Amino acid sequence: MRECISIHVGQAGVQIGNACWELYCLEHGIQPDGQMPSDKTIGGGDDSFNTFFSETGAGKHVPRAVFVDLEPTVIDEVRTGTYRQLFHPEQLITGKEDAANNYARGHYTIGKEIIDLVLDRIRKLADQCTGLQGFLVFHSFGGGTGSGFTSLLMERLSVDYGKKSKLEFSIYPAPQVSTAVVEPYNSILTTHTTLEHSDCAFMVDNEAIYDICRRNLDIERPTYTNLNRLISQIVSSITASLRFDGALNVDLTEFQTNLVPYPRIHFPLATYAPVISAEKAYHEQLSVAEITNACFEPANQMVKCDPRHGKYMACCLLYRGDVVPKDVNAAIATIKTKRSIQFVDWCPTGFKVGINYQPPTVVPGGDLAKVQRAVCMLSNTTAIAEAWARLDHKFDLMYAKRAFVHWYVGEGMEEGEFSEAREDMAALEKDYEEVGVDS
Amino acid sequence: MRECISIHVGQAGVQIGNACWELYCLEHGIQPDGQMPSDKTIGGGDDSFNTFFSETGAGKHVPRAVFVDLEPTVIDEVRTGTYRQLFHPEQLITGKEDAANNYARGHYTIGKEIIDLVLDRIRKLADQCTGLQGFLVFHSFGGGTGSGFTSLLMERLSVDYGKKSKLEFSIYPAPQVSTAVVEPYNSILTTHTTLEHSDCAFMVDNEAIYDICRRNLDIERPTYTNLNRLISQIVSSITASLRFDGALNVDLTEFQTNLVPYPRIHFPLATYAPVISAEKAYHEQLSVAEITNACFEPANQMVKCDPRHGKYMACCLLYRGDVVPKDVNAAIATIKTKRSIQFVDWCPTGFKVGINYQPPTVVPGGDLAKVQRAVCMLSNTTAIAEAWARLDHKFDLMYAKRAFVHWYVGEGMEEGEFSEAREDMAALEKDYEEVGVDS
Amino acid sequence: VKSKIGSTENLK
Amino acid sequence: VKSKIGSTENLK
Amino acid sequence: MREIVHIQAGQCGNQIGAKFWEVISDEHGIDPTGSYHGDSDLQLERINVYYNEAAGNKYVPRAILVDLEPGTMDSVRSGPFGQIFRPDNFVFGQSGAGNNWAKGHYTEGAELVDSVLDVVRKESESCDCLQGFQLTHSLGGGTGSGMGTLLISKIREEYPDRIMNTFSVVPSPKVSDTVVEPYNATLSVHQLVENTDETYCIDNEALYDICFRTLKLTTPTYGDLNHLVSATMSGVTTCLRFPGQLNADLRKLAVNMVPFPRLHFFMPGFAPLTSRGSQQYRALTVPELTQQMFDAKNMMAACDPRHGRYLTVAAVFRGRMSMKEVDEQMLNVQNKNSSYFVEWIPNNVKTAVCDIPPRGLKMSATFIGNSTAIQELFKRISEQFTAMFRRKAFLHWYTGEGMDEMEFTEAESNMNDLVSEYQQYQDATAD
Amino acid sequence: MREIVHIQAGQCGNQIGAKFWEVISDEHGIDPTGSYHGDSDLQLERINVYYNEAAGNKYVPRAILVDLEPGTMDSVRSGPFGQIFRPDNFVFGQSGAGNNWAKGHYTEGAELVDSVLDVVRKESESCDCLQGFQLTHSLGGGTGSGMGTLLISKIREEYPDRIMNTFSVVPSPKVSDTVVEPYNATLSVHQLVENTDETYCIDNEALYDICFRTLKLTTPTYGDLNHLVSATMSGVTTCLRFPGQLNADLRKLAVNMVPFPRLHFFMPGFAPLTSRGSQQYRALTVPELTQQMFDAKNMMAACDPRHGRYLTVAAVFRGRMSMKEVDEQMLNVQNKNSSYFVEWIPNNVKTAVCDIPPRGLKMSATFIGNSTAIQELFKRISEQFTAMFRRKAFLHWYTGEGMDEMEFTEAESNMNDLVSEYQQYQDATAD
Ligand SMILES: Nc1nc2c(ncn2[C@@H]2O[C@H](COP(=O)(O)OP(=O)(O)OP(=O)(O)O)[C@@H](O)[C@H]2O)c(=O)[nH]1
Ligand SMILES: Nc1nc2c(ncn2[C@@H]2O[C@H](COP(=O)(O)OP(=O)(O)OP(=O)(O)O)[C@@H](O)[C@H]2O)c(=O)[nH]1
Ligand SMILES: Nc1nc2c(ncn2[C@@H]2O[C@H](COP(=O)(O)OP(=O)(O)O)[C@@H](O)[C@H]2O)c(=O)[nH]1
Ligand SMILES: Nc1nc2c(ncn2[C@@H]2O[C@H](COP(=O)(O)OP(=O)(O)O)[C@@H](O)[C@H]2O)c(=O)[nH]1
Ligand SMILES: [Mg+2]
Ligand SMILES: [Mg+2]
Secondary structure, eight states, rough: OOOOOEEEEEEEEEEEHHHHHHHHHHHHHHOTTEEEEEEEEOOOSGGGGGGEEEEEEEEEEEEEEEESSSSHHHHHHHHHHHTTTTTTTTTEEESSOTTOOOOOOOITHHHHHHHHHHHHHHHHHHHHHHSSOOOEEEEEESSSSSHHHHHHHHHHHHHHHHSSSSEEEEEEOOOSSSTTTTHHHHHHHHHHHHSSOOEEEEEEEEHHHHHHHTTOOSSSSSOOOHHHHHHHHHHHHHHHHHSSSBBBOOOHHHHHHHOOSSSTBOOOEEEEEEEOHHHHGOOOOHHHHHHHHHHGGGGGGSSSSOOGGGGGEEEEEEEESSSSSHHHHHHHHHHOOOOTTBBBOOOSSSSSEEEESOOOOTTTOSOOOOEEEEEEEEETTTTTHHHHHHHHHHHHHHTTTTTTHHHHHHHOOOTHHHHHHHHHHHHHHHHHHHHOOOO | OEEEEEEEHHHHHHHHHHHHHHHHHHHHHTTTSSOTTOOOOSSOOOEEEGGEEEEETTTEEOOOEEEEESSSHHHHHHHTOOOOOOOOOTEEEOSSSTTTOHHIIIIIHHHHHHOOOOOOOOHHHHHTTTSSOEEEEEESOOOOOOOOHHHHHHHHHHTSSSEEEEEEEEEEOOOOOOOTTTTHHHOOOOOOOSSSOOEEEEEEEEHHEEEEEEHHSOSSOOOOOHHHHHHHHHHHHHHHHHOOOOSBBHHHHHHHHHHHSSSTTTOEEEEEEEOSSSSSGGGGGOOHHHHHHHTTTTBBBBBOOGGHHHHHHEEEEEEEEEEEEHHHHHHHHHHOOOSOOBBOOOOOEEEEEESSSSOOOOOOSSSOOOOSSSEEEEEEEHHHHHHHHHHHHHHHHHHTTTTTTTHHTTTOTTTHHHHHHHHHHHHHHHHHHHOOOOO | OOOOOOOTOOOO | OOOOSSSTTTTO | EEEEEEEHHHHHHHHHHHHHHHHHHHHHOOTTTTTBBBSTTTTHGGGGGGGEEESSEEEEEEEEEEEEHHHHHHHHHHHHHSSEEEEEEEEEOSSOOOHHHHHHHTTTTHHHHHHHHHHHHHHHHTSSSSEEEEEOOOOESSSSIIIHHHHHHHHHHSSSEEEEEEEEEEEESSSOOOHHHHHHHHHHHHHHTTTTTEEEEEEEEHHHHHHHSOOOOOOOHHHHHHHHHHHHHHHHHHTTTTSBBOOOOHHHHHHOOOOOOTTOOEEEEEEEOOOOSSSGGGOHHHHHHHHHTTGGGEEEESGGGSSSOEEEEEEEESSOOOOHHHHHHHHHOOOOGGGGBOHHHHHHHEEEEOOOOOOOOOOOOEEEETTTHHHHHHHHHHHHHHHHHHHHOHHHEEEEOOOOHHHHHHEEEHHHHHHHHHHHHOOOOOO | OEEEEEEEEHHHHHHHHHHHHHHHHHHBOOOTTTTOOOOSTHHHTGGGGEEEEEESEEEEEEEEEEESHHHHHHHHHTTTTTTTSSSGEEOSSSOOOOOOOOHHHTTHHHHHHHOOOOOOOOHHHSEEOOOOOOOESSSSIIIIHHHHHHHHHHHHHOOSSSSSEHHHHHHHSSSSSSSHHHHHHHHHHHHHHTTSSSEEEEEEEHHHHHHHHHSSSSSSOHHHHHHHHHHHHHHSSSSTTTTOOOOOOHHHHHHHOSSTTTEEEEEEEOOOOOOOOGGGGOOHHHHHHHHHOOGGGGOSSSSSSSSEEEEEEEEEEEEEEOOOHHHHHHHHHHHHHHGGGGGGSSSSSEEEESSSTTTOOOOOOEEEEEEHHHHHHHHHHHHHHHHHTTTTOHHHHHHHTTOOOOHHHHHHHHHHHHHHHHHHHHHHOOO
């Protein structure tokens, strides 16, 4: 009835997709080979998981996902792993050479070789839908494929579909921790090119999740798997309203309607609570008010920034499980009372509420404790202007010397595109400065 | 009641006939020696396979086929193989020397030696029929026997029978892949001589089937056997309406009525779907709409050409198996809606529909997966004008230097026949150009 | 070269 | 550099 | 059905034919006594292509041995497989040509040609459907050159529509084994260009280059060279004897390979060829066969094909293969190396695939290239013939046998016309 | 998929490559006979990066051995793992360069480069998707320097977009093993700075310093030095062969490590390195690997990185690790020691983590630093070259091979330009 297509671009996208699809199969009881042990009805019915899983053959559920990568390493990890029989063999699309953390490669040189194949696969998936709401694109800014090919695919999908919601789950470049030396270039170019072709891009940060795993989960040494599982919990909290009925449902279009005040400001920060280990779970009364208050703690934000340095323009609180709406009402009123949580004057109604019935599902061998309820906050705040200014300063420092510029110019990039992207980023910084002014 | 005589000329014809008769014996349960394990009724009844198999002796079914070749190699492969006891010993006709990829030899020099024997065998077969509908001639253009003797036999059959439908299954010369150096000569001469003596010639291509086996069947290294089996699937889809009852039956005359708008344009392209391996069969919902859409993909055409470069003049969709006609109606309406599938303005009703009950039969040890339904498309489009122009350009390049011309002139060919055939081919190119003009 | 089919003989 | 969103176009 | 009459002429040619019959009898499972001791049923299915049955399950090769001296005949009779030949087919004189074309063509070969033709007619009458004739000889010798050209003329007169195939050993570019080699070569080519349907250019020097460079043989004997030539011979007529996915008899090859009646001199090749040690480091794939086939250093004719253009190309493969792979390799070679193929011929390569590989191999492929680079051979022979004829060097040896000097002039003119034709067709714009 | 063509050149380079192939075959479980006898399934999943399959489950390394003297070739053939190399890839002359760059680059290497390039083309045609080329050689020698630079020029001309990586053994600051080492080094650098994508500076003296100071080896042989260099080599291309949490192929390293096209000379390192006895006193944690990596006395290039600034840094880790720990250590190093990193580049360190550690270790990490301290090496070589060229010391040995003195002047000018560029970028205020 209502379908959603997930697109996983780059290594980060594919790994987060592995985590998300493990969590989906756990929540819906789908075996790793697509079979269902309680498969009483075959060939129809509801079975609300038709949003992400399509019924094929006789008693097999195939994810509505396209995995895209330019090198075969990660997709081959997928092709020979636990869920090799889950995905359609043609949904796992690979090139032959990586983008080498080069936006120019993944956008012009290499992305042009498989963009048509990816779009044809996406078209084949979309033709099997009757109520396709939108797409979910998982990627990272500071990467190669996940930046250049992500922007190219966003442009092509904006051309082909147009009015379908285009949501992104992006790994924002951390302010201190980093992987690539040329992350500012790729991040600025991606932001410039995919800005007007995206509806809502959810921001997460590896450094903030590191800090959350250290402080809250009591994990001194987490790997990328723990980060991927937490991001998967966030994704499941976002899509649970589609996959499960609740007291107050929120489809995907309501996110872009409620969280995006202006067409150029669509970067809401992800936040999840409660995130606690199993040891301290027995010593806390995880009430609605406690989790609602923990959602606004500066130490619990999934992006390394300080919300107290800015104002909230739009906030979305998605509750799950044993949640009473009166308690949500009271907790949000208490939040509005606090003077340390500043909202813009031009948004007197600042919250959007969603309440589901399905409690969070514990992944076997996971980190998070079994809780009765959880809240995922998607807040659009002006505090991300500081992160954008930091990225702009790094970009300026690297570009004033023309460092690494030849690596992009020799791949089909015209040098003026750097200047154009930088001017647009300055304009975006001015946008964020202007919306934060009370008048 | 309704009988059809298959004629297999040349090595390609005989091998495709081996494949087709294996598939026929599998579909009708006939043992390789002509016996039937469920032979409850002997000497009559229905047993709809009387169209291709004649009841002889007491409990033996003999194919209504004539195998013709000028060298004994392939027919001796047949005479000592699995089906040595299936065919009538006099239906396997051989000369003593090959045509050596020379149209002149197989048409004048060698073909005159066995044309009377072949025609007498065909007459003996036709006298055993009461409702003979037409003939099926399997051959290849760029060959020897399969070109010269094929044209000679077509002329003689047009003289003898006249009003019986004369359908051909021809291996069109591939644009890049080739076997003989003098394929343009043989192809042009055959097309010129058999044009006015043929009712409908189905086009297939070895290069396109190579690409289909690589992309769809996931077969990196297919032999001629896989190509022959796919062509046999196409032939079975064409003749299933005669061999099996369905919701909407289509005899052989309806093909020439619906697919041939003008007497000189009777080259419809074969297309078959779904063509998938057994591995990806469990991950796809092969609905009527999916197969109907896959039939119009430029990457799934059995002839290496681009249908988007031309317009469709007549299209025939033959469905088999678990097929609901309402879904066929809706899928064809969806096809008509798409603007990328262009039809000529002078053909507002562009489709002809046939629905059978017998699902496709899997050949043991075959390549294609077991499916619940399949669609064979026979589309007459103006895109083949590009292939005809390519053949004309190759013919001109070879003939401007008089290369290989003596090999034909010394075999009874008059040199003016080359010029006459080239003029007629130019006229055919102009025909294809004229029909494609909207007015 | 001229075409041979009469596709325009009665274009009325 | 100038901003691009019209947040003050109808500040009335 | 389709039968071939093999004719041996001269030491250089009959010496090959012995090894050729060894290889052929090995392929069909016929021991040195004529008895059949094979395994596969396909070995006797087309056994009559080369072998007459001798009433008692002994098979006799349809071969005719011709020479002007009985020494090579005795050597063939005494060696292995010398007991399978029919004794009536050893036709030999007593004098010998002495590497004199005029002698062997006008006096001694003229005295022996009647008996040779009687044997040829007797062999042709016993056939079911004569496909053609097969001659093995050298061009720079005596009996070989003159006797073979005389026999070709006679048989072409008697059988005008049968196939005349000759496997000629051509003069080497560096080392000549006969002081009068240019005269014999020029006269033999003058006779060959008028009567043969296709002729293969085997050059010994190229064979030693292959044996040392590729096979890594430090002591290669004429057994090895004759074995390479015999492997080529067997690869040529494989489609006439064993079934395959694509059949191509001698006439199909002649049609697809000879664009104009006079340009029918081919450069044969063979693959795979590996040293004894390097076998464990080379995987046998169709791309590997294709890479070794279209290799200038692999040609059995000492003419670099990179100095000319390919008019036509024949590629007869043997063994279980994928047609897609072979077609893909042929197309990739034509596309990537288009600057070496003739412009006015699309699809320059003829493809044939047989099911039965040679003895001991998983698969192989025989290369038959019709390149304009053979004009190098012809021009070198013409220049040497001119240099020797201008001074009448050893011309008396040929004029004393009744031969005319105007005949030498005509032969030189025909050689130069062939050179000029080969040069005319290469680098000729297809526009 | 992504394949690398390894090229061996010279005694100093081919001698490394032998140990390199020993180590690589050990990692993938391929015994000295080419047979596979590994345990983990991941060993054959990406085996085609270095190994061609030889039709029978024997794997042949995609390596090419080049030298101007057959002695080292015989030594490689006779030693262990000498039977896995394909015999066709041993390309060698007979004369030898004699530590003369002009000779090996203009006469002997010029005579041999055609065969070497034929072998290179044959290896490149067999690939699926050629990632790049890998050369191991020395700069102060004969065959190594000149032959490798000639091959790099030729291959860069033929394959302009593939990756050209060279692991060059550079002259030592104190003890020279060749009296003409400055000339060869200067000319080799003049050729390298124009064609290579990245080059690693291995210095023997630094390797002996590591062997004595860290490994506590009293009798270190060239087995140990070549083993350290081979460990570095294997750590470089680990992400192309085994999966990991962060993948980084050769092109990603080249992009993240080379800010400007001419500054691509790196200082490789390796960790952990412990003596045999001190193993029981050192816990293996990611902080320990980080502490040993960013250590001046651990660099394999005899240039103190504390005398310059780091333009870019690559840190490729191997084994099961926490990403938080690696990122934490990298950030702590950048923050606490900020005075040694270039100001106008934020986030100087590139991070890559693989899942499979080296043989016998729980985990390790390969250091690849692009520091401006290499200007010390370049300036020392330039000063020695000037001191020798001012008196025309042994200049006749190079001018007698047809080399121009103006070419020496141009090479010196290019060396000094590289030195000046390296000095320009360090201590350049980011304001
Ligand atoms: N949270 C999280 N982040 C990841 C993960 N894997 C990679 N990343 C982030 O991705 C960024 C680098 O971009 P990649 O996704 O690895 O590069 P890519 O998309 O594959 O593009 P290429 O450069 O062509 O390889 C780093 O900053 C990482 O923090 C993951 O599993 N979880
Ligand atoms: N699809 C398919 N095509 C074939 C097959 N066998 C031969 N062909 C095609 O046939 C063409 C050559 O013509 P042939 O049929 O082999 O020649 P012929 O009809 O026997 O006539 P002759 O020249 O006298 O031998 C080639 O282009 C092949 O692609 C086959 O088994 N399947
Ligand atoms: N390949 C090959 N060439 C040979 C053999 N014997 C002789 N030749 C060549 O044939 C030439 C000599 O001609 P030959 O046939 O012996 O003279 P003839 O007997 O009078 O025809 C020389 O150039 C030899 O190189 C052989 O066994 N194999
Ligand atoms: N690390 C290492 N260095 C070597 C080895 N053999 C030689 N060298 C160095 O290479 C230099 C000699 O150059 P060399 O390659 O032998 O001369 P070439 O053969 O003409 O290229 C000397 O400075 C040696 O220190 C070795 O096995 N390992
Ligand atoms: Mg990647
Ligand atoms: Mg045939």
